[PDB]
Amino acid sequence: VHRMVELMYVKHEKRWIDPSLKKLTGDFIRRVEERFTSVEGQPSLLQNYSDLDEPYPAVDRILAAYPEASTQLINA
């Protein structure tokens, strides 16, 4: 999720190379959520892709809500 942001969001210009790619990075994030939640009811921390507009500040918030997402590698 980090490398996604790194390579599609230009830091020193506070812009995404394209909204679509912000969606992309957003969707995968949504996924990591799912991978790491195991009970119905909990809503997404990234509820609007608007959140990713200033990403790096917000992203870390979500990723931190799902601890293990920093411990284990992607599922095959």
């Binding site: 284990q72 590698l73 599922n75 095959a76």
Partner: protein, 48 residues
């Protein structure tokens, strides 16, 4: 297991713990690859 580790120095044991957790990450990777691609078993074709 703990009792074996009590033979070592925190120096040693903690060095080992870093080794282990790296392995697990390889293992984890492999196991998931296998499940998906049916390669949890890989026949060797030639000796080393």
């Amino acid at each position: 297991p703990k009792y074996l580790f009590a033979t070592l120095d925190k120096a040693q044991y903690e060095a080992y713990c870093v080794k282990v957790q790296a392995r697990q990450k390889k293992a984890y990777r492999f196991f998931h690859n296998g499940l998906i691609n049916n390669k949890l078993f890989v026949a060797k074709d030639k000796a080393p």
